[PDB]
Design a protein around this ligand. Sequence first.
Ligand SMILES: *[C@@H]1O[C@H](CO)[C@@H](O[C@@H]2O[C@H](CO)[C@@H](O[C@@H]3O[C@H](CO[C@H]4O[C@H](CO)[C@@H](O)[C@H](O)[C@@H]4O)[C@@H](O)[C@H](O[C@H]4O[C@H](CO)[C@@H](O)[C@H](O)[C@@H]4O)[C@@H]3O)[C@H](O)[C@H]2NC(C)=O)[C@H](O)[C@H]1NC(C)=O
Ligand SMILES: *[C@@H]1O[C@H](CO)[C@@H](O[C@@H]2O[C@H](CO)[C@@H](O)[C@H](O)[C@H]2NC(C)=O)[C@H](O)[C@H]1NC(C)=O
Ligand SMILES: *[C@@H]1O[C@H](CO)[C@@H](O[C@@H]2O[C@H](CO)[C@@H](O)[C@H](O)[C@H]2NC(C)=O)[C@H](O)[C@H]1NC(C)=O
Ligand SMILES: *[C@@H]1O[C@H](CO)[C@@H](O[C@@H]2O[C@H](CO)[C@@H](O)[C@H](O)[C@H]2NC(C)=O)[C@H](O)[C@H]1NC(C)=O
Ligand SMILES: *[C@@H]1O[C@H](CO)[C@@H](O)[C@H](O)[C@H]1NC(C)=O
Ligand SMILES: *[C@@H]1O[C@H](CO)[C@@H](O)[C@H](O)[C@H]1NC(C)=O
Ligand SMILES: *[C@@H]1O[C@H](CO)[C@@H](O)[C@H](O)[C@H]1NC(C)=O
Ligand SMILES: *[C@@H]1O[C@H](CO)[C@@H](O)[C@H](O)[C@H]1NC(C)=O
Lengths: 595, 192
Amino acid sequence: TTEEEARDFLDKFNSEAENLSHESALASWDYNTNITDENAQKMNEADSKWSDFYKEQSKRAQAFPLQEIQNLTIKLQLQILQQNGSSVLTAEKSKRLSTILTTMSTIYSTGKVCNPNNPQQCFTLSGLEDIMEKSKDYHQRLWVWEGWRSEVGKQLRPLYEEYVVLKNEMARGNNYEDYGDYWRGDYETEGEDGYNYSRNQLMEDVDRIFLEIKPLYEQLHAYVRAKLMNAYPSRISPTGCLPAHLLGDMWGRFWTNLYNLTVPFEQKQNIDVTETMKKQSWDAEKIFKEAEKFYLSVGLYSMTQGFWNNSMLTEPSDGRQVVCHPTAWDLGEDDFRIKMCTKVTMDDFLTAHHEMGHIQYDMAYAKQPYLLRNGANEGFHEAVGEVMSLSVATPKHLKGMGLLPSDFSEDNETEINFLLKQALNIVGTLPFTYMLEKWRWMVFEGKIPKEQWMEKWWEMKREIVGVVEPLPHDETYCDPASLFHVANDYSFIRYFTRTILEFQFQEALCKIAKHEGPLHKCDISNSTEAGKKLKDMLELGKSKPWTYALNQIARTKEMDAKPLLNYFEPLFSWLKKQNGNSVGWSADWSPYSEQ
Amino acid sequence: CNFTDLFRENAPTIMQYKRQVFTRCNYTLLLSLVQVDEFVKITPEALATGCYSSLTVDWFAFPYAWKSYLAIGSADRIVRFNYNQDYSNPRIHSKVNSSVGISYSGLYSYITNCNYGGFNKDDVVKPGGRASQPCVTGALNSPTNGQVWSFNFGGVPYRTSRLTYTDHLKNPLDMVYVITVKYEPGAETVCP
Ligand SMILES: *[C@@H]1O[C@H](CO)[C@@H](O[C@@H]2O[C@H](CO)[C@@H](O[C@@H]3O[C@H](CO[C@H]4O[C@H](CO)[C@@H](O)[C@H](O)[C@@H]4O)[C@@H](O)[C@H](O[C@H]4O[C@H](CO)[C@@H](O)[C@H](O)[C@@H]4O)[C@@H]3O)[C@H](O)[C@H]2NC(C)=O)[C@H](O)[C@H]1NC(C)=O
Ligand SMILES: *[C@@H]1O[C@H](CO)[C@@H](O[C@@H]2O[C@H](CO)[C@@H](O)[C@H](O)[C@H]2NC(C)=O)[C@H](O)[C@H]1NC(C)=O
Ligand SMILES: *[C@@H]1O[C@H](CO)[C@@H](O[C@@H]2O[C@H](CO)[C@@H](O)[C@H](O)[C@H]2NC(C)=O)[C@H](O)[C@H]1NC(C)=O
Ligand SMILES: *[C@@H]1O[C@H](CO)[C@@H](O[C@@H]2O[C@H](CO)[C@@H](O)[C@H](O)[C@H]2NC(C)=O)[C@H](O)[C@H]1NC(C)=O
Ligand SMILES: *[C@@H]1O[C@H](CO)[C@@H](O)[C@H](O)[C@H]1NC(C)=O
Ligand SMILES: *[C@@H]1O[C@H](CO)[C@@H](O)[C@H](O)[C@H]1NC(C)=O
Ligand SMILES: *[C@@H]1O[C@H](CO)[C@@H](O)[C@H](O)[C@H]1NC(C)=O
Ligand SMILES: *[C@@H]1O[C@H](CO)[C@@H](O)[C@H](O)[C@H]1NC(C)=O
């Protein structure tokens, strides 16, 4: 009778959890759209009510052991609740870990770097990021990059070192080998037949993807190097790695700001629809209404009346201050909202659809039990939104919406510029994500001595992404922690996963749509078969293993890079013609070793 | 034509301004009874005489010093959420002596902000049209300090704020009378 009692328990939990979730989500939404000292405390108190509830219910959940229960639906919901987390640690260790997390976050957020050649000038991180994405001055770029690492990396290293040990002890308390293993568990699923995925299997598939994407990256790297070598003459070897501070990114994650240096065809113009929208007198209302039609044309869900009346879709003129950053909200009780400050710009024409795509997924699994109201994997949540975003960006859609001339067509030079711009955001970001996630995993696992944490980080970076730091760090430095998602407790594999899933989903939906052509020309709208198939997967949430949810679209059990390589197939061929024998890089090169 | 109500005790606010249409009646005296400070398409001397299809006058309390943005070309809050004067059918600023029953009791206010829906659309006044009731109701329930409050009317969320001009109290006060004359031929029912 354990399962029967567990079922009654979960139904009671889910009912109260929804009511408390609504109060907290609403208080948070109201605060973000109305910043007042009166709303501030209000939101927290609402959050605490849910938290106190969740922990009391956690203790109750542990009265229903998973070994005795046979129904997988019940086991999954209880498994979510039956987690001690930090409550495996003593009061001193629990409080100490919380203190360290707050401290590391603060050091990053309030960090600044001052100009070594003029003490009068100093910039906060926001100003330093602005320099990295814009400046072409080798010197300015160098002192801001170096300074950031010295100013925060040397304050966080000690905190992160103690943070690691404490996170590992916590994970042991929760029956994991280490904290890396704890995070790997987010991909672990229990089930029968072939629908079973292990924590160690995650590592193996990740290595496999890296090797499959690797040759596309090697072609992109040689091309980018060949062009940056002229932009920064005598600073980069014909064969070798790229300087970290010249990647257009403070942390070397994205290469998108290099597009202007690495553009395939300089004489060609890109497509910018902003001018058309202004001439046609578009509003924010037009952008969102068209976003709804896009999804109706795909064959998914309409928006509710509450969505249109309550969401904050544009910045107010009232005088109240608001938070501007695109977020999809789910307040419970079928209350779905999008928060953003929409302008009549081509970028927002893609963002509105992206956020709308998050809502489409959130609505789809609304029929699931409270605890299972999530994506099959965090990678699915984001990957689905991105696939829909690409479908909208595709010129065929823009023509359909009346945003392009009927006499407009693309040549094979335009396609190359488009694909490379995409590659700088999609391909150049992958071996980075892989490298950094793997390094931390080894740190938490305990495969690297503390004194060697830094040395392994840069050796991996030279071999995996081909990026080098111009001035050596003795060891006291902790460069990884200079990034938001390392100083704070965040995982990066989801981003590696998000990208691969995006392409697996895009390709699968294209064949259903019967698109006889390249994936960068393929759209998903006006194919209700593709819409229905996508509906079926989105609806599942966490009631099924992500391997099941993946199979429902891509007919596979695991991650697969082939769809990505397919998308960029014509780019790959062009890059070969440009790169010749320069493909790949020498990991033995470093600016410091030049003299 | 009976104009008693134009200089009567119950001076209105703009948010709830008053108007009276005159027809089939005989209308200089109105200008003699009050003290005029200024005159602003039709020449006021041409307005003062002749036969009209209809004559419609609206009036409300309003500081003389604020006349700068009551005029056409203004995009002030005093135009869009307050009073949008129509100009399709071709404005006297005056003060009223305490010797004339002009009680001017209560508080005199106006709407500064009023919008709704997910796009924060401004519920602006049509020419010759009062502020929307949703705007009026939100303003009545506003703190009067200018803080914007949330209201919900018919299920539709609104944002509204109110301010006053009840500090501008002189014995003569400050009032504005706007006379619009419809000169359409074939009617001519309002004559001197
Ligand atoms: C941005 O965030 C702020 C902070 O929360 C919001 O401010 C609140 O707005 C609500 C209205 O939405 C206010 O509620 C009303 O309070 C009136 C009483 O005001 C006096 O007393 C309060 C203390 O309780 C003082 O703070 C205030 O200064 C006054 O001295 C009530 O009379 C109102 O009653 C109405 O609603 C009830 C509903 O049950 C009906 O029964 C009544 O008949 C009547 O219709 C109402 O309760 C609230 O007091 C404001 N808080 C503060 C601190 O001032 C902003 O509205 C929000 N802005 C936006 C755009 O979201
Ligand atoms: C959370 O921690 C408690 C201990 O504070 C765990 O309960 C113990 O489990 C062991 C192993 O089965 C038993 O020998 C002890 O007698 C239990 N103690 C109590 C007070 O029940 C609990 O299992 C942990 N829960 C999870 C999900 O890790
Ligand atoms: C790449 O070059 C383009 C110009 O072709 C830059 O676009 C300009 O950006 C500024 C803002 O800094 C705008 O004020 C201009 O109006 C833009 N010009 C055009 C024609 O749109 C673009 O910013 C450059 N990329 C980078 C990373 O610097
Ligand atoms: C883009 O397409 C054009 C047109 O097909 C290609 O240019 C042709 O290349 C062949 C092979 O050398 C020549 O015989 C033709 O005379 C060329 N036509 C013109 C108008 O120049 C071009 O090479 C293609 N570019 C890429 C990168 O594939
Ligand atoms: C598991 O529980 C669900 C209700 O949450 C029920 O519909 C399903 O039939 C049960 N499965 C088995 C095998 O009992
Ligand atoms: C979908 O079909 C409609 C006609 O019903 C057409 O107007 C629209 O442009 C098509 N969508 C695309 C992306 O071509
Ligand atoms: C108002 O009162 C003053 C002072 O007695 C007087 O001079 C003026 O003529 C009066 N104006 C009107 C319109 O009655
Ligand atoms: C807003 O919601 C109400 C129901 O409360 C509905 O009648 C109205 O049509 C909706 N308005 C819009 C613009 O969606």
